[PDB]
Amino acid sequence: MDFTLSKQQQMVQKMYREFAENEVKPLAKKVDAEEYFPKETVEKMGKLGMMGIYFPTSVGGAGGDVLSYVMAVEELSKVCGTTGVIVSAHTSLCAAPIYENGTPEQKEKYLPKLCSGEWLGAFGLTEPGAGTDAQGQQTTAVEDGDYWVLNGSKIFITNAGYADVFIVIAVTDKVLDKKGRPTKLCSAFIVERTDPGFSVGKAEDKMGIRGSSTCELIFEDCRIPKDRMLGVRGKGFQLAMATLDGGRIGIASQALGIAEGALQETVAYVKERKQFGRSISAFQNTQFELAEMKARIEAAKYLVYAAALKKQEAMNGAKVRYSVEAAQAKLIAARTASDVTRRCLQLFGGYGYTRDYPIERMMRDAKITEIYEGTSEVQMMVISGALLK
Amino acid sequence: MDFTLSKQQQMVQKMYREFAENEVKPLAKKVDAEEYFPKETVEKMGKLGMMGIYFPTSVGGAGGDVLSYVMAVEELSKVCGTTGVIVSAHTSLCAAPIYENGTPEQKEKYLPKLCSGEWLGAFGLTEPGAGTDAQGQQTTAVEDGDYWVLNGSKIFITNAGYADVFIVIAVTDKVLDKKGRPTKLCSAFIVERTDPGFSVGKAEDKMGIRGSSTCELIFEDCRIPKDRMLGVRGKGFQLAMATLDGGRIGIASQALGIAEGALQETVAYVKERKQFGRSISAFQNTQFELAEMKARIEAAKYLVYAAALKKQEAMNGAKVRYSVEAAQAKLIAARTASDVTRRCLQLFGGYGYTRDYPIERMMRDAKITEIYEGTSEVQMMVISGALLK
């Protein structure tokens, strides 16, 4: 086995890191405190080809590998969880389901505009009564002529207030199952922000990742063309779950990035600040706290990367499943973030409780990583299901 | 050996419970979201005698017990950890050392207006670079005729922006130790807000308890009368640690009340919300998390209570030390609070990540209770000190 980076992967890593510290770090505190969507850094990332990394040049992407995309989300989230999830959402939850389930007409129209950055992407699959359910979703899609009519709502939509194209999961077929119970079949749809009967709600007031534009999607007789259906009919829910599988790797790297930047800022703090006449780093407890955290972070890092490479295999035709790898990565990375950021803030003393230092923002940003794109309990469901079979 | 709340302790419980549910709950959101000091709350509590509970009637108090004070903070912190911090700071950090080491003159010049709510109390010991090393501090006081003069700064001072009387620990004498090392001896000083050359800084921006006024104290030629020295000269730091012994109990009840209010809102949330065709309280995981958390919260309550009862003994003339009980309560109650609050928010899912529910405010509030008034590391030093000796 090889656990070393390709000399190109080391080079793209150092590119993302420098862009993060030079152009995204100096904006990190304004974005969180003012709930400010970083419209400047999203056009900057687009001109760098960072909104298309792992997608090929034949569809407008940058021609990178999945692992480069993961390093980009991790390196961005070392300084800003809002910036990091914006790339992670647009990439794995809008651009990816179109690239993997799209016709050559759908790819040609949307994908070179998603990789470029003129169009931002979003996912709607969660509903209020049943985001965490497959039957409790009610947004419907009815045939009418050569168009589709959508009615319903979606909640907790990332990039909603600033996205151009949306992947929407609606119930189309009302079918009967083997056991005789009525089961609801969903289909996936490419919904544009310019569509009639479609509206994005007011940006949500969240604890962390506050710059992230989190709004509702409202469908009131939203009439869309017939070709906007992505994939097969009635298989839109399976599409939503395979899309979430890749989207869970992006959140696992975001949490890994939040925990990694927290350890940097904490290592930098304990070295300069003095207590009891010595540097904080001179006491045995500060040394054991940091050491154990660094090991847990490095263990989490290998899980994120193993999930990224397993997806890369499935992309290259090697027929393997990576839902378990993604599931383990999000479980351990998200719990590592909330665990590390709490204990790093503990080292700053009272000075970590004020906005002077960003650890209090990392601790807030890490709590969503345990929850969104599927909670850790949903990850444990996916993991144990494959284990107990 | 009785673990029941008497007959009057069983009642001030519901006095402080109903009041906190009706008067104090509607306001915790504005208090925390707009950094709003709950002045109305403080006025209602002043007229209720809640600012003087365990102080006798001979000084302006309500003739209560330390436990009923401990319960007041707990029931206030179950709804608003900001309001509980205002009472506990004033009571245990300002009114407590004035009565515990003050002269009849001092006891009659300050305590009546403190126990009646007319004056808000505060306390200053922390400095920018000697917080934990509170014994190597640099604020000094020198004699001038029949006045003292004090020059320096105090940081992280709860209630400073709205307080009327402060207690200050200044370095008065530089004397020699047993083996020739020079050392710094401190003395306690009662400082009015109206004293010349004393200014209160601007309100810091903390992660939680943002409604409290934590501020910096600036002493520029602070000319105070001679009779405002508290305690015996040169023994201020012993007095500083004796005042934090009681206050550590108060922070123990605040973290406990946060954990208790978090557990309350979680049981009420899981009993109604239905995800999988039944209430989320039907998952074996929801039952196992709330049950284990409840036992942890019960056990911490017994530490918080065992600490208040030991102070009452010491205060009732028994020669007993309660610094260890106080430490074990603040260590465990604070760690419990953060662990309960992060776990209950996970049960809320994405909804607990918004400002709709108080669980995001509870987690932000819990984090401080592990830091201020002696971090858990400082608490463990105390606990280890007595044990390993």
The 3-state secondary structure of chain A, one letter per residue: CCCCCCHHHHHHHHHHHHHHHHHHHHHHHHHHHCCCCCHHHHHHHHHCCCCCCCCCHHHCCCCCCHHHHHHHHHHHHCCCHHHHHHHHHHHHHHHHHHHHHCCHHHHHHHHHHHHHCCCCEEEECCCCCCCCCCCCCCCEEEEECCEEEEEEEEEEECCHHHCCEEEEEEEEEEEECCCCCEEEEEEEEEEECCCCCEEECCCCCECCCCCCCCEEEEEEEEEEEHHHEECCCCEHHHHHHHHHHHHHHHHHHHHHHHHHHHHHHHHHHHHHCEECCEEHHHCHHHHHHHHHHHHHHHHHHHHHHHHHHHHHHHHCCCCCCCHHHHHHHHHHHHHHHHHHHHHHHHHHHHHHCECCCCHHHHHHHHHHHCCCCCCHHHHHHHHHHHHCC
What size, in residues, is chain B?
389
In A262-301, the residues whose Cβ lies within 8 Å of chain B are 274-277, 285
Domain boundary among A90, A119, A148: A119
Distances (CA, A) of A7 to A3, A303, A312: 12, 21, 18
Distances (CA, A) of B86 to A291, B159, B232: 37, 6, 28
Is residue A252 located within the same domain as residue A220?
A: no
Q: Does residue B370 belong to the interface with chain A, where contact is any CB pair within 8 Å?
A: yes
- Asked if residue A2 is part of any domain, the answer here is no
Q: Which residues contact A319 (CB under 8 A, 6 or more apart)?
A: none
Tokens in use for B162?
């709205």
What phi and psi values does residue A269 have, to the nearest 5 degrees? -75, -50
Q: Does residue A251 belong to the interface with chain B, where contact is any CB pair within 8 Å?
A: no
- Between β-strands A121-124 and A165-176, what pairing exists: parallel, antiparallel or unpaired? parallel
Contact A353, B368 (CB under 8 A): yes
- Asked if residue B4 is part of any domain, the answer here is no
Neighbours of A277 (CB within 10 A): 9
d(CA A110, CA A61): 11
Q: Which residues contact A297 (CB under 8 A, 6 or more apart)?
A: A256, A259, A260, A263, A336, A340
| Closest by CA position to A342, among listed B375, B350, B156, B73 | B375
Gyration radius (Cα) of chain B, Å:
21
Contact B57, B48 (CB under 8 A): no
| Closest by CA position to B228, among listed B189, B195, B194 | B189
d(CA B369, CA B339): 12
Contact B80, B44 (CB under 8 A): no
Method of elucidation: X-ray
Q: Does residue B212 belong to the interface with chain A, where contact is any CB pair within 8 Å?
A: no
Q: Does residue A384 belong to the interface with chain B, where contact is any CB pair within 8 Å?
A: no
Gyration radius (Cα) of chain A, Å:
21
d(CA B192, CA B215): 15
Is residue A137 located within the same domain as residue A222?
A: yes
B315: helix, strand or coil: helix
Candidates A207, A270, A341, A345: best to mutate against B (most CBs of B within 10 A) is A207
B386: helix, strand or coil: helix
Of B129, B346, B377, the CB nearest to A375: B346
Chain A residues touching residue B368 (CB < 8 angstroms): 350, 353
CA angle B108-B114-B115, nearest 5°? 90
Q: Resolution in angstroms, to 1 decimal, for this deposition? A: 2.8
d(CA B257, CA B70): 10
| Closest by CA position to A327, among listed A373, A260, A375, A382 | A382
Number of domains present in the structure of chain A = 3
Is residue B111 located within the same domain as residue B221?
A: no
* Sequence letter at residue A301: K
A297: left (phi over 0), alpha (psi -120 to 50) or beta: alpha
Q: Does residue A377 belong to the interface with chain B, where contact is any CB pair within 8 Å?
A: yes
Distances (CA, A) of B285 to A81, A381, B343, B344: 29, 12, 12, 12
Of A275, A353, A355, the CB nearest to B371: A353
Chain A residues touching residue B210 (CB < 8 angstroms): none
- Asked if residue B3 is part of any domain, the answer here is no
Separation in Å, CA of B363 to nearest CA in chain A: 9
- Asked if residue B2 is part of any domain, the answer here is no
Write the CATH number for A207: 2.40.110.10
B166: helix, strand or coil: strand
Q: What is the DSSP letter of B322?
A: -
Chain A residues touching residue B377 (CB < 8 angstroms): 285
| Beta carbons of B353 and A126 less than 8 Å apart | no
H-helix or E-strand containing B332? Answer: helix B323-348
Is residue B279 located within the same domain as residue B207?
A: no
- Asked if residue A195 is part of any domain, the answer here is yes
Q: CA quadruple B341, B346, B349, B350: dihedral positive or negative?
A: positive
Of B354, B360, B377, the CB nearest to A285: B377
What is the layout of strands, in order, in the sheet containing B229-230? Answer: B198-200, B214-225, B147-158, B140-144, B165-176, B182-192, B229-230
H-helix or E-strand containing B241? Answer: helix B236-272
Chain A residues touching residue B349 (CB < 8 angstroms): 132, 371, 375
Q: Does residue B363 belong to the interface with chain A, where contact is any CB pair within 8 Å?
A: yes
Q: CA quadruple B250, B215, B161, B142: dihedral positive or negative?
A: positive
Distances (CA, A) of A361 to A31, A343, B313, B363: 11, 13, 43, 13
In B26-85, the residues whose Cβ lies within 8 Å of chain A are none
d(CA A97, CA A106): 11
H-helix or E-strand containing B40? Answer: helix B39-47
Separation in Å, CA of B274 to nearest CA in chain A: 8
| Beta carbons of A371 and B363 less than 8 Å apart | no
Is residue A250 located within the same domain as residue A374?
A: yes
d(CA B386, CA B311): 17
Tokens in use for B96?
């407590």
Give the residue from chain A lying closest to B343, CA to CA: A367
Write the CATH number for B81: 1.10.540.10
Tokens in use for B318?
């028994």
d(CA B51, CA B38): 14
- Between β-strands A140-144 and A198-200, what pairing exists: parallel, antiparallel or unpaired? unpaired
What size, in residues, is chain A?
389
Tokens in use for B279?
């209430």
Cα-Cα-Cα-Cα torsion B266, B272, B273, B279, nearest 10 degrees, comes to 100
B3: helix, strand or coil: coil
- State the residue range of the domain holding B288: 243-388
Is residue B218 located within the same domain as residue B273?
A: no
Contact B330, B372 (CB under 8 A): no
DSSP-derived secondary structure for B246-312: HHHHHHHHHHHHHHHHHHHHHHHHHHH-BSSSSBGGGSHHHHHHHHHHHHHHHHHHHHHHHHHHHHH
Q: Does residue A330 belong to the interface with chain B, where contact is any CB pair within 8 Å?
A: no
Q: Does residue A349 belong to the interface with chain B, where contact is any CB pair within 8 Å?
A: yes
Is residue A102 located within the same domain as residue A127?
A: no
d(CA B370, CA A350): 10
| Beta carbons of B367 and A345 less than 8 Å apart | yes
Write the CATH number for A351: 1.20.140.10
| Beta carbons of A349 and B275 less than 8 Å apart | no
Kindly tell me the burial class for residue B176, based on how many C-beta atoms sit within 10 Å of its own C-beta (0-12, 13-18, 19 or more).
exposed
Candidates A353, A375, A378, A383: best to mutate against B (most CBs of B within 10 A) is A353
| Beta carbons of B355 and A205 less than 8 Å apart | yes
- Asked if residue A1 is part of any domain, the answer here is no
Kindly tell me the burial class for residue A317, based on how many C-beta atoms sit within 10 Å of its own C-beta (0-12, 13-18, 19 or more).
exposed
d(CA A326, CA A307): 5
Is residue B150 located within the same domain as residue B233?
A: yes
Is residue A85 located within the same domain as residue A130?
A: no
Give the residue from chain B lying closest to A356, CA to CA: B205
Is residue B54 located within the same domain as residue B111?
A: yes
Angle between helices A323-348 and A359-369 (to 10 degrees): 150
Is residue B210 located within the same domain as residue B282?
A: no
Separation in Å, CA of A117 to nearest CA in chain B: 28
- Asked if residue B274 is part of any domain, the answer here is yes
- Asked if residue B128 is part of any domain, the answer here is no
d(CA B389, CA B383): 10
Chain B residues touching residue A338 (CB < 8 angstroms): 342
d(CA A163, CA A52): 15
Contacts of B138-142 with CB under 8 Å at 24 or more apart are: B138/B171, B139/B168, B139/B169, B139/B170, B139/B171, B139/B219, B140/B170, B140/B171, B140/B172, B141/B170, B141/B171, B141/B172, B141/B187, B141/B189, B142/B172
What phi and psi values does residue B86 have, to the nearest 5 degrees? -65, -45
| Beta carbons of B353 and A133 less than 8 Å apart | no
Chain B residues touching residue A275 (CB < 8 angstroms): 131-133
Chain B residues touching residue A205 (CB < 8 angstroms): 354-355
Q: Does residue B133 belong to the interface with chain A, where contact is any CB pair within 8 Å?
A: yes
Separation in Å, CA of B128 to nearest CA in chain A: 10
d(CA A172, CA A235): 10
Is residue B217 located within the same domain as residue B326?
A: no
- In our burial notation (b when 16+ CB lie closer than 10 A, e otherwise), range A198-209 reads bebbebbebbbb
Domain boundary among B220, B237, B254: B237
Distances (CA, A) of A276 to A283, B136, B389: 10, 8, 21
Cα-Cα-Cα-Cα torsion A192, A195, A197, A200, nearest 10 degrees, comes to 40
| Active site (catalytic) residues of B | 373
Domain boundary among A86, A119, A152: A119
Distances (CA, A) of A270 to A153, A264, A279, B109, B369: 48, 10, 6, 44, 21
d(CA B337, CA A210): 24
d(CA B366, CA B335): 8
d(CA A284, CA B389): 20
